[PDB]
Amino acid sequence: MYTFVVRDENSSVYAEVSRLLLATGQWKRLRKDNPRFNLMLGERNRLPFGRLGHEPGLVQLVNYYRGADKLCRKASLVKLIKTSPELSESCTWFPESYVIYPTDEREVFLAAYNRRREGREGNVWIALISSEASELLDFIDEQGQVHVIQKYLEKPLLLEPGHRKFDIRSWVLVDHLYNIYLYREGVLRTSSEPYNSANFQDKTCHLTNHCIQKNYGRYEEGNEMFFEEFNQYLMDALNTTLENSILLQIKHIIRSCLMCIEPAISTKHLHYQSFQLFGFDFMVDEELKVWLIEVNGAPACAQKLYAELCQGIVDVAISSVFPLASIFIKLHH
């Protein structure tokens, strides 16, 4: 009998994981504060990593990597890419980005902005989307919070029919041994309204996430296209596969990101162990070049895929440490 505790209420992913652990009957749930657990499903906010791995005769495992926030905050990520030799300013798969503070790299941003306006090539940026530098910096100050200014991707790949925008979400599980597992099922979060080169204030055609899409649901159930249909499209429309044109690049990016922070976050020789589920968000441009947009440290899943993934989380992350009585592509670390 193994013991576990639940400290995140709002987590759909781990609500289903606990439900699955209980269903084996070989896992008993304890109350939030009982420290005699084998497994912690932690809070997102100020999780007490300092209190783990100090219980004699209990192997302890947590579902977050301490330090993985470096990858999972927009300002942190830019800094990480720019300052790490492994990734660099030369980095070809992350959009040109700048950290902007209001009471910092404001001067470096303006100089690159003007050099874009030498013969005036595409000079549209995101923070929320604008075409000139002045309305961007004025918006950031109106908030009193740190944000990122990023070269907006003016030439996206557009699904037909419908001239539609999209982002790809990939689910990645890093286990206690730092194996990087990419869940074979991804998802495209589609726009339902035709993409508009001229009008950057209209936001249902430029921004793709599941919530801000409330013309919704027109082409696929809930603005979600899956890999089978997207691959079919790519074969029929572009004479390629999802594997060749997109996934090679996705696998490369994921692997580069996670190998870069590995010395800083690995639990290989530590008194407690960690695993974590990440959501990487990708943009595809019209030449089928992939760009990383966001890494999410506490992602939700797509409704259809909950059962399979959550079961996978139990198989490779939990039972591997705590055995009982593949849906993942392992990215070779």
Partner: protein, 428 residues
């Protein structure tokens, strides 16, 4: 803190007391005449806790024998280790207490108590650094109960900075002398709650049931009951008596076992359970000891541990065994039952080891639990008290000695308070 002073009062008190000294003298290499004839240094290093050294060179128990009747004490004197006791430490009257707490506490006992305190004083004066006192008595009779609790109150007055520890035998209808036992026990519990630091609840109900259900003795005697008591008593005092990795005394026991001063009534347990005569040859494994020591059927207080929570536990393992395997098994049983241990006292289960096993065993485990389930014992006595008291039945035996019914009402209320004070910590 070196010397313990031992007091045994009344029939039960003196019978379990004599057996305790038989057992621990055997464990320490001491024979009936007071002579050391053992072959381990561990036997002598802390012998001053319980024994005085006469120039002899003899070892004399720091033990005072008290009764209001001569019978039981004459029996001690002509019993196996009878000659070992300092004859000046036999303090006895002639009239008896008639199973009456009022006689022991107010009338007959009052007459004898000063001469007991004289003997207590002489022993206390001869102490390098007195830890405090241990009393054996029952709560159901008159002398151990009424006079025993009178002694405790007078000992506390004269030595308010010493520890008071009791082994208190609780009455049961299953092994009963008189109908007035619940009266005598309730009056006594009221006293124990205020004036002891720690009390082992030795429940005659539990002792009976163990002898009957587990030891397969169809008709248990007091002798069979006392076999269990002396094994438990040897076990719980191991860490006071022998040098080890944890060196304990009565105060350190109290500090670490009692989180709230009134909640000081311990449920002791023992494994393996055996009888006198027919004894097992099959050796016990560390997982078997650990499982048995925590089983309800091995507890000396008839309460269900699952109907409450452990505030604190001390566990003592005796014999040559793997201390690594002990630690693992103790941790295993906590980690697999952690809802029964309060989560607001970290590390509330403590284990200690001693190499010397008790007589006739290769290994043994002794259990000391402060559980909120002990409330079941007190509730049982309360129900029996109220069944009689609501009709004032048998009260004339007490009013005849000058007591008033108010005193019964007060002792009942205090024992009910104790019960709901346990219930309070069982929820949080």
């Amino acid at each position: 803190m070196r010397e313990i002073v031992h007091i045994q009062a009344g029939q039960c008190g003196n019978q379990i007391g004599a057996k305790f000294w038989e057992v621990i003298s055997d464990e320490h290499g001491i024979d009936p005449t007071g002579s050391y004839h053992g072959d381990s240094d561990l036997q002598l290093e802390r012998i001053n806790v319980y024994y005085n050294e006469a120039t002899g060179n003899k070892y004399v128990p720091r033990a005072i024998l008290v009764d209001l009747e001569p019978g039981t004490m004459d029996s001690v004197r002509s019993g196996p280790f009878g000659q070992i006791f300092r004859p000046d430490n036999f303090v006895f009257g002639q009239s008896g207490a008639g199973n009456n707490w009022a006689k022991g506490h107010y009338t007959e006992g009052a007459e004898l108590v000063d001469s007991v305190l004289d003997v207590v004083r002489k022993e206390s004066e001869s102490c390098d650094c007195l830890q405090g006192f241990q009393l054996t008595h029952s709560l159901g009779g008159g002398t151990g109960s009424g006079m025993g609790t009178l002694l405790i109150s007078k000992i506390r007055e004269e030595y308010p900075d010493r520890i008071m520890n009791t082994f208190s035998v609780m009455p049961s209808p299953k092994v009963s002398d008189t109908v007035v036992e619940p009266y005598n026990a309730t009056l006594s519990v009221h006293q124990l709650v205020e004036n002891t630091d720690e009390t082992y609840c030795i429940d005659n109900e539990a002792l009976y049931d163990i002898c009957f259900r587990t030891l397969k003795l169809t008709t248990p005697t007091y002798g069979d009951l006392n076999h269990l008591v002396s094994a438990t008593m040897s076990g719980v005092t191991t860490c006071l008596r022998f040098p080890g990795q944890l060196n304990a005394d009565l105060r350190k026991l109290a500090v670490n076992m009692v989180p709230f001063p009134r909640l000081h009534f311990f449920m002791p347990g023992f494994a393996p359970l055996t009888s006198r005569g027919s004894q097992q040859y099959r050796a016990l494994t560390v997982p078997e000891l650990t499982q048995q020591m925590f089983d309800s059927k091995n507890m000396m207080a008839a309460c269900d541990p699952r109907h409450g929570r452990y505030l604190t536990v001390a566990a003592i393992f005796r014999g040559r065994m793997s201390m690594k395997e002990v630690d693992e098994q103790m941790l295993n049983v906590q980690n697999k039952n952690s809802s029964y241990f309060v989560e607001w006292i970290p590390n509330n289960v403590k284990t200690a080891v001693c190499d010397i096993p008790p007589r006739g065993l290769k290994m043994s485990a002794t259990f000391i639990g402060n559980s909120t389930a002990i409330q079941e014992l007190f509730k049982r006595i309360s129900e029996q008290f109220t069944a009689m008291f609501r009709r004032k039945a048998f009260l004339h035996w007490y009013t005849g000695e000058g007591m008033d019914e108010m005193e019964f009402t007060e002792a009942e209320s205090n024992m009910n308070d104790l019960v709901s004070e346990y219930q309070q910590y069982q929820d949080a």
